[PDB]
Amino acid sequence: LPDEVRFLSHLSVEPRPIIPADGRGLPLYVQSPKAYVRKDGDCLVIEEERVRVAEARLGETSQVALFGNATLTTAALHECLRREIPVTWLSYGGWFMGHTVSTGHRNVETRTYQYQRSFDPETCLNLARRWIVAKIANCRTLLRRNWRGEGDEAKAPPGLLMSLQDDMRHAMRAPSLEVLLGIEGASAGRYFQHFSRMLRGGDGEGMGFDFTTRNRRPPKDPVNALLSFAYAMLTREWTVALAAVGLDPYRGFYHQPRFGRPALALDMMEPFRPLIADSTVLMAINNGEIRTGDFVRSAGGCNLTDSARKRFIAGFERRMEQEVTHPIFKYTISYRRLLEVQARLLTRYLSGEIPAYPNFVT
Amino acid sequence: GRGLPLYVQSPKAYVRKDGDCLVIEEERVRVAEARLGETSQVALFGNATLTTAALHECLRREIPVTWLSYGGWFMGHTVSTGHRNVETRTYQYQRSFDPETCLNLARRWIVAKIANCRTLLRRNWRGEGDEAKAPPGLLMSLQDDMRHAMRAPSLEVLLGIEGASAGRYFQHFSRMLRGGDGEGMGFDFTTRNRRPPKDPVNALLSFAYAMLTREWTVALAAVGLDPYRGFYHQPRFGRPALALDMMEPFRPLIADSTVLMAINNGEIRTGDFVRSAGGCNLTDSARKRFIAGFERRMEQEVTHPIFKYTISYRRLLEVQARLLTRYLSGEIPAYPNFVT
Amino acid sequence: GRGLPLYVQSPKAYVRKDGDCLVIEEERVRVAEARLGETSQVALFGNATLTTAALHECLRREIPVTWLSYGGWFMGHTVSTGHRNVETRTYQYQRSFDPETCLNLARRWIVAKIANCRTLLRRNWRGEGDEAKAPPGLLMSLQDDMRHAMRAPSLEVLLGIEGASAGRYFQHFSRMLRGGDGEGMGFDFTTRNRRPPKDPVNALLSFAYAMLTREWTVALAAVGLDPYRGFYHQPRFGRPALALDMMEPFRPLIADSTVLMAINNGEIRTGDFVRSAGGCNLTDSARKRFIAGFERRMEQEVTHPIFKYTISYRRLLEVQARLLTRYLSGEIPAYPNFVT
Amino acid sequence: MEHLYIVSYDIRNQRRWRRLFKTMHGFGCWLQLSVFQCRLDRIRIIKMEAAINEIVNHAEDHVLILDLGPAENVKPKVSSIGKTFDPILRQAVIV
Amino acid sequence: MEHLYIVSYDIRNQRRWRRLFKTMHGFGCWLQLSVFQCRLDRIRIIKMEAAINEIVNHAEDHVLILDLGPAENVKPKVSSIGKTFDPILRQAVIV
Amino acid sequence: GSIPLIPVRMLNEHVYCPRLAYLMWVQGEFSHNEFTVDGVIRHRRVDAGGGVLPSETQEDSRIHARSVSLSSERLGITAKIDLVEGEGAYVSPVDYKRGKRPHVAGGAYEPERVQLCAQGLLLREHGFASDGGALYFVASRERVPVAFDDELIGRTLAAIDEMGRTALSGTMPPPLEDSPKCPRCSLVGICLPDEVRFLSHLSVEPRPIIPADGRGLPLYVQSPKAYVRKDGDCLVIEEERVRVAEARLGETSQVALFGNATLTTAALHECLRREIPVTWLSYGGWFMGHTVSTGHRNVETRTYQYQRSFDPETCLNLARRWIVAKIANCRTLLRRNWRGEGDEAKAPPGLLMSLQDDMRHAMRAPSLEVLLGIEGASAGRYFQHFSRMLRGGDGEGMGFDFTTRNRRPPKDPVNALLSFAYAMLTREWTVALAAVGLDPYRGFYHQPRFGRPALALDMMEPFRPLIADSTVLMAINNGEIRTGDFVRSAGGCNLTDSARKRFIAGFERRMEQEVTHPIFKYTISYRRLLEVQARLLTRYLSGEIPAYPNFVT
DNA sequence: ACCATCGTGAGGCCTCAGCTACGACT
DNA sequence: TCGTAGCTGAGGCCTCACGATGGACTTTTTGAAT
Ligand code: SF4
Ligand SMILES: [Mn+2]
Ligand SMILES: [Mn+2]
Ligand SMILES: [Mn+2]
Ligand SMILES: [Mn+2]
Ligand SMILES: [Mn+2]
Ligand SMILES: [Mn+2]
C-alpha cells in the first residue's frame, strides 16, 4: 500500500489510481437447508434431492459459507484446505457458529502489536471514539440523503441533526467507554426510532418496525429479522477479512469476546453497519424485492422463505460489488476491497507506521 | 480435568449424536460412543463422516474437531467461535512477556529433556559385552547438569549449558548403536544440527525432529494456543517457537527412540543414503519406511502423565498441552513435566 | 451467305476439331460434323463438351458460340474479339439515326405482320358450320390496311393505323377458337395488352409474346447486333426496342399459333386460371405445359426464307437477323421480309 | 481487466480426452459439442496455458483458444442459432 | 471494412450435415474438426446469415459465428497448439 | 410509347433522390449493398411466397392477401402490394421494412408514406376503400399505421407528374447537395455524387471515399494444362488429376483463362448464373475471346458513346488529352525513378524540354495522324532511354532493344515482359468498360482490330507507365525475374511457369496498390480507379460534366 | 474423356453411464 | 456410507471414398439508405 502508507504517513503526496483487483474470487453461499456439497475433480457440485443444482469453478471461488443444515463431503473440505479457501458454518438463521483455521497466520508482529494495542486502554478508548463517531456520521449521511418525505418531510428534521451532531461531540468527549456505550445506545435508539422515515416512503403492509426489538434474539418483526440477518451475515465477511491479514479477529478493543460474535470484527464493522446492512435492507424493501408474503410467521417470529433468502443474499452480494469512492484517496473501489484496505491500514497503525487510523467517514 | 481425545480410524465411520451422546456406526452397525462427558478433540481420519447436527452440538460445547487423512495426515482443525481459546491465548500473551515465568518454564523443560536422556541411557545403553553399564562419571556429570539447569540464572546461560550437556550426551550417543560404531552410518558429535545432514545419523535425527516438532504444532493448535509465540526460542522468521519449547523433553522418548529402533532393527541400512557435497539424504523408500517406523513409535502407550490411563504418546501430547493450560491462567502451579 | 447454325441436343456430346472440321462424338463413337464451311453459331445444350482447341479455332473464325441448358434454356453467348460485330453495330448506329430507313423498315415489318395475320385467317378460320369462309369485307379492309401501311407518311401515323388494324384483327380473333366463343376463356378486343391479364386469352397471348420477344433477343444478340436500340419502338427504359421491331411479323406464325393449338387441343382449360382483382394468371403446371407447347411450335419447320431448306422457326430467326445484316452495310436492298 | 475466451479441441486419445475434459471443467463452462466458453483473468489464463501444453500432445492433437474480448460487450460479437448464447456472469453462487 | 469470423456447428442430421457442410465450403476454409475460419465482408456475412437459418433446424441443431475482428491483426487474438494457425489472405489465385 | 406505367417504389426512391430514381428506372443499373441485401432477405422468406387472392366480389371475410398485382390505367402506375389486410370491403396495404422504427414524427419518413398513399389509391381504383395502411417493420416486428392525407395524395400525384416529366425530358437530375442521403444510396458507387458535383463545376470539396463493397478478386489460370471443375458453390482447379487449389465463388470477381487450360461446361454455366465475366487468352496472353450476356442494361450510355464516336472534334480532343497524360506520366516516372550512380541521378534536362515540347505539340496536334506521329516520336525516345533505371542499368541478358516494339513474337526478355504486361492489363480495362455498359470495341482514337479492343486500347494509354512499366521495373529491380527465368526459342523470349506465377503475382499487387487521386485527394486502388475513370467518362459522354479528367500525376 | 450433385459404408471424434481400483503428502 | 479418480462399454458427431438416380433455369416488380 505504498501510496496510501505515504499519504497517511504524512509525507503528503497525491495517491495514484488504484492498482486493480487480482487473484480474487467470489464467495460460496449454501442456504438451501438440505443441500449436499460434493467434490468432483477440481469442480465443486452442489446437489439437492440428488440432482445437480449447480457447480462452482474452484479457482473462481474465494469463500464458503454454510448456512444451516447443509452437508459437506469431507473430500470437499480437504480440497478447500489444500487451496486454503476459508470455510464457515452458520446457523439456519445465520448465527456464526464455526469456521476453520490453518496453523495460524504467517505474521506474528502484527498480532503482537495488536495485543499491545489490546492492552493500552487509551488506544482502545480513542479507537472506539473514532469508530462510533464514524458510525453516527454515516447515520448523518444516510439519514439526510435517503430520507423520503412527500412534502415538508423531504428535508430531515434539523432537530435530529444537531441531536446527532451533539452526539458525535459527546462521543469524542467520552471519558471512558462505558459512557461510550451509553452514547452509542442513545444515538442508535433515536436512529432506529426514526428509521421508518424512508423505507417505501413509509411503512408497508406488515413492514412495520419496532425499534425496541433490537437486543432481542428471535426477531418478532419482519424488518428486525432482515436487519439482524444482514448484520450477522456481514459479520462473517469482516471475520474472514481480518483473518486473512493475520489479525486475530477475536481479540478486540471495544467489544467483548462472547460466542458467535468475534469481538475485534464486531468492533470493526460498526462504521460499515449503515453503509452496508442498512443500505441493503433499504434497497430490497423499496425496490419491492421483499414483501409481506416473503416472510414466514412462527412463535420464533419472522423468518425467511427460500426465495426471500435467495434474493436477499443476491442483493447483499451486489452491494459488496458496488463501487464507491474513498473520501481520502478519491478513487473507485469495491466495498469488499475496502474491507482489506481498512484492515491493513489498521495493521500499519498498530505497527505505528502511520499516525492515526482512517475511519472512512462519508 | 475436562475430558480425553477421541479417535476414529475408520474411513467407513458414520457418526451422529444421541442427545448428549456421540454414536459411532460402521455399516448402520454400531461401534463406539463418546457421550460427551469426558471428551476432548474429535479427530476424524480420512473420509470419516459425522452429521451436521453432531457438529453443531460439538461447536456449542466448544470442542476442536480436527481432520486427518486416511493415512493419518493432519490437514485441518475446526474451531467454534467461543471464548475457550482466546482466553487461553490472551493469558499466553501477557504471561509471555513475564520473564521469570519463562525462566521457570524453560528450566523445567530443559531438565525434563536431560533427565529423559540419562533415563534413556539406562534404557538402551548398548555398550554391552564388557560395558553393559555406562560410564558412571558421565552420569555424575549429567545429574550435575540438571542441577546446573535448576540454578539457571538467565536464559542465555540456560542455552549455553544446554549445548554443553547436549554435546555431552551426543558424545556417548554412538554407544547407543546395536553393539558398536555404525560403520557406513557414523555419528558426529560436532556437526550437530548443521543444516543439511553431513551424517546419516544426523539425517535421521533431523527428520525425526522435523515430524516431532510438526506433531507438537498440530497438537498445540488443537488446544486454544498459538504455537509460534514461544517463551524460550525466538518467535519470528517462521520458527514455531512454542512448539520448539514443547518438543525438547520428548526428543529422547520419540525422535531419538525412533532412530534407535530404525537402526538397530535393520530398517535403516547403508544403501538408503545419498552423499551430495556434504549431504547425506535419504531415499523416498527409506523415508516412508522410516515414517511407518515413526508411526510405530507413536503407537506405543505410556500410562502416567499424572494418572494411570496408558495413552499413546499422541494423546499424551494433548494431555500435556492441556496441563500447560492448567498451568497458565493460574490454575495449577509450576507445570509438572512428564518424565520417565 | 456464309453458313447455317449447328445444334447439338446431346448432354453426352464431345466435340473437337478435325483441322477444318468440327467432329461430334457420342461415346467416342462418332455422330456429326460441321467442317466449318457453311457453319453459323455453335450452340451447345446442357453440359455438352467441346475441346478448347476447337473453341480457339472457332474464335479465330469469328463464330458466336452460345450456351443452352439441357432443357434448352439460353444462358450465354461467347464472342471473339474481332471486327465482325462492331462493324455491324456501328452500321446499326448511324443507320439508326437515319429516318427514312426507319420508315421503310417499319412499314415492311408492319405489312409483314398484317399479311401474316390474314394468311393466318385463312389458315385457321374456324367459323365453320356455316362460315368456313371468313367475312370478305374484313379482307378488303385488311388488304387495304397493308396498302394503308405502304403509303405510311410518318411513324406515328404508322402506329395509329397499326393499332386500328390490330383491333380489327382481334375483333375476329374470337372466331379462331375451335368452333365458337371460348366460354370460361373469353377474349376482349379492347383490354388488349393491359398490363396484368384481364382475360385468359390475353394472359396466354402475353406470355407467348414474352417468350417470343425473348428468343428474338437471344437470336439478335447472337449476331453482332444490339437489341435495345430499335428503329421503331422507344429504346430506353428496359425495352428491347430492336427486338420489339423484329418480333412483329411473327406474332401470328408463332405466338398466336401457340395459343391456337394450346386452346383448340384442350391443353388449356378453365381450371388452369386464377382470377385476382382483374388478373387472370396461369398455374405453374399450365405454364410449363404451355411451354412444352411453345417448344412444339418452335419445332415445326418452314422452308422458304429465300431458299428451300426447311428450317425450324428458330434457325429462321438467325437467318432473318443475318439477312438484316445483309440489308445493313448496304449489301442487299430493302430487306425482303419472310411472309407466308 | 477481465476477458472472455472460447476454446475448441480435437484430441485423439480417450485418456487425454478425459484429462483435458474435466480440467477444462475446471476453467469454464461447456457450450458446444467440443467447445467451452471461458471468462477469465490473466493469471488463470496463464495457468490454463501451462496446463494445456502438457496434458495435450502437440504434434498430433489440436486445441484453440480465442480471446473474444473484455466480456462486457460480448454478444455484439456472438451469434447463436441453436440454443441461445449468453456468456458467463460473475456473481457468487448462493444456492 | 473486412472482418474475420469463426464458425462452429453441431448438427444431428447427415442430410443437413452435407448441405451445411459444403455450403460452408462456399464461405470460408475448413480449420478444425467442425470449425471453419471465415474472412468476409458485410454483404456476404448477411448472405451467410440468411442461408444458415434455413439449411439448419433451429430447436435442435446449434451453430455459432464469432467475429474476431478486422482481420488485419487477428493472430494477436488467436493461439494454436496443434498445427499453426494463420488466417485467410486475399490475393487472386494464380495457379 | 414514350413511357409505360411507373413502378411504385420508383416513386419511393424518387422523393428519396430524384437523380437516383432517374438512374434506377430510366436505365436501371441496380446494385447491392448491406441494406439492399438485408431488405431482400427479410422480404423474401415470407412475402415472396404468395398468399390469399383478392376476391373480385367481397361481402364478409378476412383477406390476408400477399403479393397482389395491381396497376392503374388512369393513374399511370403499377404495383405489387407487400401485403393486403382487409375486413370484407375495407382493405389496407401492408409494407415490410428491414430496420428499426425511424426516430421521426410518425415513425415513417416521407418516401414510404408516399408508397402507402399511392398504392392505397391504386387499391381504391380497383374498387376498394383503403384510406390508410401501415408499415410493418420486420426487425422490431411492429406495425405503424399510416393515414392517407390530402396533400400526401398531392405529393404522390405531383411526384407522378414530375417523374413523367423528367423521363420525357431525358435529363440527368443533379445529385444531392452534399447530403448524408447519398453515402448509403447503394449507388454512390455509380452516382459518384461528390465527384459529379466537384467536376460538375459547382465547386465543393469531395469527401472521403465510400469504401469498397461487393468486390472480389480475379481468377488467373496460367497452368497450360490445368482442369477447372465445379463442385457445388466451390470451384476447384486441378492439374494432373490432383486438387491444386479452389477459389470461393463469391470472392471471385473475374476469370482469365491463359493458353490451353480446360473449363468444365458446368463451371461456365455457374459463372454465367453469377454473371462473372470469363475471358480467354493465348498462351502468350493474346486476348482472343470472352463472354457476354444479353448486352448491358443501359442504352443511353452507348448512344452518347457513339455520338462521341462520330464527332471528330470530340475524338481529337480526347486523344489529345489521353496522349498528353501518357507522356506526362512519362515525365513523372522517368525523373522520379531514374537511377544513376553519380551525375546521371538527375534526369538529363534535355530530355525534359524534349518531352515537354512533345506535350505542347500534342495539344497542338491538328488531326490525329499528326498525333500518331507525335505519339511515336515521344514513345521512341522514352523506350530508347528506358534502360536508364532498371537495376540501375541493364543486367545479364536483360538488355533492351527499343526497336523491337511493333514486333509480335518478342526477341528480348524485357520486350516479352512489356508486351505481356500490356496485353494482360488490356484485359482488365476491357472488363471494366464492359461492366459500365460501354462497348469496349467502339473507340475514338484507336481502331478496332482483332484481339485489341479499340476503346479500351485508347483507354489504357495513360495508365501504361503507372501500371505496366511500374510492374516491370518492380519485378526486375526487386530480383523477382532473372535471366534463367526466361526460355529461348525461335519465337523468342518466353516465360517459365515460375516466371509467370511471380509476374502475375506482382501485377496483382500493383492493382491492389493504393494511390491518391490528384484531383480528389484520397486513397483508392488502381482497380477502383479503373471504374471511376470509366463512369466519369460515361458522364462526360452524357454531357453531365464539362470535360474528362485525365488523371495526370 | 459426357459432368457434377446425391447417397452408403466405414473410421474416427465425442461424451456418458458404469463400472473398478486405490488413499495426493515429504 | 469411503468418495473419487480412472477405465469400458455404447451412441452419436464428423468426414471421406465410392458408388449410383439422370441433364435446376418461367412474363413482370421488389429490393436501403437520412
Ligand atoms: S448520391 Fe445516391 S441518393 Fe444521392 S442523388 Fe445520387 S444516387 Fe440518389
Ligand atoms: Mn533444543
Ligand atoms: Mn406491335
Ligand atoms: Mn473438437
Ligand atoms: Mn461441432
Ligand atoms: Mn418492402
Ligand atoms: Mn499506343
PDB file of N, CA and C and ligand atoms in Angstrom, chain C residues 110 113 162 166 232-233 244-245 247-248 251, ligand 3:
ATOM      1  N   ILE C 110     -44.555  -3.981 -90.604  1.00  0.00           N
ATOM      2  CA  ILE C 110     -45.975  -3.871 -90.301  1.00  0.00           C
ATOM      3  C   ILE C 110     -46.807  -4.638 -91.315  1.00  0.00           C
ATOM      4  N   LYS C 113     -46.416  -8.365 -90.570  1.00  0.00           N
ATOM      5  CA  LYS C 113     -47.410  -8.757 -89.580  1.00  0.00           C
ATOM      6  C   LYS C 113     -48.755  -8.991 -90.226  1.00  0.00           C
ATOM      7  N   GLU C 162     -51.585   0.984 -87.320  1.00  0.00           N
ATOM      8  CA  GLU C 162     -51.258  -0.290 -86.699  1.00  0.00           C
ATOM      9  C   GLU C 162     -52.305  -0.677 -85.679  1.00  0.00           C
ATOM     10  N   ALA C 166     -54.936  -3.742 -85.896  1.00  0.00           N
ATOM     11  CA  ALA C 166     -54.783  -4.800 -84.911  1.00  0.00           C
ATOM     12  C   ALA C 166     -56.073  -5.022 -84.143  1.00  0.00           C
ATOM     13  N   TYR C 232     -37.933   1.616 -84.495  1.00  0.00           N
ATOM     14  CA  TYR C 232     -39.355   1.907 -84.439  1.00  0.00           C
ATOM     15  C   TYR C 232     -39.879   2.141 -83.034  1.00  0.00           C
ATOM     16  N   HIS C 233     -39.585   1.255 -82.105  1.00  0.00           N
ATOM     17  CA  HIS C 233     -40.027   1.456 -80.737  1.00  0.00           C
ATOM     18  C   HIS C 233     -39.051   2.375 -80.016  1.00  0.00           C
ATOM     19  N   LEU C 244     -38.321  -5.738 -80.289  1.00  0.00           N
ATOM     20  CA  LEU C 244     -39.738  -5.484 -80.479  1.00  0.00           C
ATOM     21  C   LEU C 244     -40.049  -5.235 -81.942  1.00  0.00           C
ATOM     22  N   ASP C 245     -39.164  -4.527 -82.633  1.00  0.00           N
ATOM     23  CA  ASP C 245     -39.370  -4.259 -84.047  1.00  0.00           C
ATOM     24  C   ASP C 245     -39.327  -5.547 -84.854  1.00  0.00           C
ATOM     25  N   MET C 247     -40.009  -8.624 -83.727  1.00  0.00           N
ATOM     26  CA  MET C 247     -40.952  -9.663 -83.355  1.00  0.00           C
ATOM     27  C   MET C 247     -42.334  -9.455 -83.947  1.00  0.00           C
ATOM     28  N   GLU C 248     -42.593  -8.305 -84.564  1.00  0.00           N
ATOM     29  CA  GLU C 248     -43.931  -8.052 -85.088  1.00  0.00           C
ATOM     30  C   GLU C 248     -44.375  -9.112 -86.079  1.00  0.00           C
ATOM     31  N   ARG C 251     -45.516 -12.557 -84.626  1.00  0.00           N
ATOM     32  CA  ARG C 251     -46.577 -12.765 -83.648  1.00  0.00           C
ATOM     33  C   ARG C 251     -47.593 -13.775 -84.148  1.00  0.00           C
TER      34      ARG C 251
HETATM   35 MN    MN I   3     -46.565  -4.092 -82.107  1.00  0.00          MN
END
